[PDB]
Amino acid sequence: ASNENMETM
Amino acid sequence: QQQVRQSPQSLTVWEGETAILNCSYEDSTFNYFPWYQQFPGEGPALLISIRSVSDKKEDGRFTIFFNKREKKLSLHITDSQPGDSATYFCAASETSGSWQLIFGSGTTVSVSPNIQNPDPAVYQLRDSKSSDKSVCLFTDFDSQTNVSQSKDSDVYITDKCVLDMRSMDFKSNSAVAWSNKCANAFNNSIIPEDTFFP
Amino acid sequence: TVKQNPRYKLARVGKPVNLICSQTMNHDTMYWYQKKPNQAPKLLLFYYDKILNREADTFEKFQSSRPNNSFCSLYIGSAGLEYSAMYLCASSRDLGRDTQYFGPGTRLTVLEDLKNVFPPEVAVFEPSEAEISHTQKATLVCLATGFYPDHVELSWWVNGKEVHSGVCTDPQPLKEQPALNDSRYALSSRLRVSATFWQNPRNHFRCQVQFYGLSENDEWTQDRAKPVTQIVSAEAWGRA
Amino acid sequence: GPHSMRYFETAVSRPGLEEPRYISVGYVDNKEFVRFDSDAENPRYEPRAPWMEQEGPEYWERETQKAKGQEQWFRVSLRNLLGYYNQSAGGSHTLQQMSGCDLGSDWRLLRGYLQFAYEGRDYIALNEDLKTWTAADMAAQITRRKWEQSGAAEHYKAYLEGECVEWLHRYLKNGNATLLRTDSPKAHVTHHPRSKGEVTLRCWALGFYPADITLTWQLNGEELTQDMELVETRPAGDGTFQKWASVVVPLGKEQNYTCRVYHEGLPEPLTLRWEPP
Amino acid sequence: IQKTPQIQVYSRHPPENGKPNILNCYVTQFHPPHIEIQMLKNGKKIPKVEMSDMSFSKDWSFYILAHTEFTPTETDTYACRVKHASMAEPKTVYWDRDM
Ligand code: NA
Numbered sequence: 001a002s003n004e005n006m007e008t009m
Numbered sequence: 010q011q012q013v014r015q016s017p018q019s020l021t022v023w024e025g026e027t028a029i030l031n032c033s034y035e036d037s038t039f040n041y042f043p044w045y046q047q048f049p050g051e052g053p054a055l056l057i058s059i060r061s062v063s064d065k066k067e068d069g070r071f072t073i074f075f076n077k078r079e080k081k082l083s084l085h086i087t088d089s090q091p092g093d094s095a096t097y098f099c100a101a102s103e104t105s106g107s108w109q110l111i112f113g114s115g116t117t118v119s120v121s122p123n124i125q126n127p128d129p130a131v132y133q134l135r136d137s138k139s140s141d142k143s144v145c146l147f148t149d150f151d152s153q154t155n156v157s158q159s160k161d162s163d164v165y166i167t168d169k170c171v172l173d174m175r176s177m178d179f180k181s182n183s184a185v186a187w188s189n190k191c192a193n194a195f196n197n198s199i200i201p202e203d204t205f206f207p
Numbered sequence: 208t209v210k211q212n213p214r215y216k217l218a219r220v221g222k223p224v225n226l227i228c229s230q231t232m233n234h235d236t237m238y239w240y241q242k243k244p245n246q247a248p249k250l251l252l253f254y255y256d257k258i259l260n261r262e263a264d265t266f267e268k269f270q271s272s273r274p275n276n277s278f279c280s281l282y283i284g285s286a287g288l289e290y291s292a293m294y295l296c297a298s299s300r301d302l303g304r305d306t307q308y309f310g311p312g313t314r315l316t317v318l319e320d321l322k323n324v325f326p327p328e329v330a331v332f333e334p335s336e337a338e339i340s341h342t343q344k345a346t347l348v349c350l351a352t353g354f355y356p357d358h359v360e361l362s363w364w365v366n367g368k369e370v371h372s373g374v375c376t377d378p379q380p381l382k383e384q385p386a387l388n389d390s391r392y393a394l395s396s397r398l399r400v401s402a403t404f405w406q407n408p409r410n411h412f413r414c415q416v417q418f419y420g421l422s423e424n425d426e427w428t429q430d431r432a433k434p435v436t437q438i439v440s441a442e443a444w445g446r447a
Numbered sequence: 448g449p450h451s452m453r454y455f456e457t458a459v460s461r462p463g464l465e466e467p468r469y470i471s472v473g474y475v476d477n478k479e480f481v482r483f484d485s486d487a488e489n490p491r492y493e494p495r496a497p498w499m500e501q502e503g504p505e506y507w508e509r510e511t512q513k514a515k516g517q518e519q520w521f522r523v524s525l526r527n528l529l530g531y532y533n534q535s536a537g538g539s540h541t542l543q544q545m546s547g548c549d550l551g552s553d554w555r556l557l558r559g560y561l562q563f564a565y566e567g568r569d570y571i572a573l574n575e576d577l578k579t580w581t582a583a584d585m586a587a588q589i590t591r592r593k594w595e596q597s598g599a600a601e602h603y604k605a606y607l608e609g610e611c612v613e614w615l616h617r618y619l620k621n622g623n624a625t626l627l628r629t630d631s632p633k634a635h636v637t638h639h640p641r642s643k644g645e646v647t648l649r650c651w652a653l654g655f656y657p658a659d660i661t662l663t664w665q666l667n668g669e670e671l672t673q674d675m676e677l678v679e680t681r682p683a684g685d686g687t688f689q690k691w692a693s694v695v696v697p698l699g700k701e702q703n704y705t706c707r708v709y710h711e712g713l714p715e716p717l718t719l720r721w722e723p724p
Numbered sequence: 725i726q727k728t729p730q731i732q733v734y735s736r737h738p739p740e741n742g743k744p745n746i747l748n749c750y751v752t753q754f755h756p757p758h759i760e761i762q763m764l765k766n767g768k769k770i771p772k773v774e775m776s777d778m779s780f781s782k783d784w785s786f787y788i789l790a791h792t793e794f795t796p797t798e799t800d801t802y803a804c805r806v807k808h809a810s811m812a813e814p815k816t817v818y819w820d821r822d823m
Binding site for chain 3: 013018041043045049050051052053054055098102107108109110112113114115128130132133134135136137139140142144146148149162165167168170171172174178179181183185187206207
């Protein structure tokens, strides 16, 4: 595998 | 509106008196209410906090008073001391954004010290040959005495600074005057004529 | 225990500004606030672990970086008048109701030119003989004059050690000429000690003033000496 | 062969609670291999495929920490979305994410995927170039403006071209059993009298994987359209699928109609009609 | 908006009286994911009912599968009760062995 998101929406 | 509203903008109380710092909100969603204390040169630090379920919360001399119906909060300082003279910020938090604190404008408190034995005197702080300036010092005067700017291009006069000391007679109020061109200085300021030295 | 260096910062319009923030508490959340005079601290952005969150109204003006849990940076590109405010950094163990620990803050002032920048002139004034005679106390007066901008940290050092007891420094400085803009500032401080302490020729007194000015990266055209970040002091030993 | 790895993430806001319900489902060639659920007694990444047991303890702990971080990302993003649309926290809101990669001829990157949806409709998506974003609404334009400034696309491109391709190669090699498994359909025709002179012939298809199937009814070459009436492909429950296609035919002339079944894994297309019993 | 669920009631293997089988209730194409599914035997709710975990399709719509072990008979009538938003009452879909 999964990916970790960077900046929030 | 959230927002947060804090009343009054500035407050001056005497040493030993109770300082009431009011605060108000509009959004019913707010549940957590922390109070942050900030001293000049330092960042804000957590003092005391309250939840929507509680209505008092005591921590020595500091006590909050929460009212959910009228959406008002008040910070009471049971026994005011000059060491409490700081800017107080009231924050607010909701469940849907507990990480975010919504701070209020802030109330600047100024606790005037209780001078037991006041000796109002103007001393000529002499003498440095390294500088052209002449330093006059007004000290040991009561907190009631207000220091004016004198309104002169030649002489500079500083506002009254407090000396938060436990020992006597170290705890007092002081004002510095200089004077480059002489010994009067105040003049224009409400100076006590009686018990004045020299 | 949040560290913020420097305490004061000065920048030119159009130049990049980078503010650093330290941890050591191994906290997950690190906040960045903007504090303007007589206004509440406004939340700019925060970092939860590696996740960045920037506020909708704030974004376009501020950038942030977190290489590790201990350090967090606030980047301004480019600087320009509106940015002139104190920037507070906060830290929290969670993303919730738990306590926010604030740093000392970085007071940033952004100006058009750096020509009017001047270091302070520090002078000590020995206590009055009449003061020692009337009351068993002696008051030393320090004077930091001709400095621009108001980026000073006054300190009292007695026998090679920083003293906070008996110190009284002005909360706001005085302007040399308050009729016009770009006026040089003046600040005074008082050290009250016992008569016996001042009359002792063994006790050493020093008024230290930490000034915040130009850096090595900053340019200087004037023939006059560069007004760099420096410590200016005045000494006294105590007459008997 | 068209090989793929996907991650289907869901975040449903819970009114009165700090953390939303976070579900993260992993897929390899449309087969569930990993799963995370916050509603579970012990929230951690669990293996859903038998071949996934070959992974060490270090892998599962690392993936659980990614999910715990994503749980917080979706929590804060959900709160920001309320402000963009002028919505309330008292109501339940859904945020969905689809991320993955496609494999070409033989174990090489073809296309990168990264899509987001708010309340079931498209919000923001990463383009084929993996550098530009496509915003569907005015609220998503704010998100695009943020992510272009912070350079989010560069980080997603690094995963999609690197880590995503690297891990899919490992999973396709480790998983040879359930991953390559193909099931041919079992077909039969059932008899049902409709009304007086008309009769309905139902062509069933059972025990087939994948779901992609074609059923065509014909009268000596010529196929029947609209009057056919087919049902949607439904799962049996044992990892296989079901489907049927009916036809309105006259009584006594039912033998003239033939059903044809088209499915990959079947060497020759199935040709069949009524028995009778 | 908010998609209405597509309900399908069927058997795992072709229905045979006396032979043990599995009754399915395929609920798909719905949004939000909050849904109530119940299996019925002659109007009465079946308690021992297994259910598949939460999943969604490429078009962001959710899909779930409810299953229970049962013995089909010519007298017993089976149905499925599905409740969701954009629906006034919980929908009841009758089980047809021929469909
Ligand atoms: Na916090």
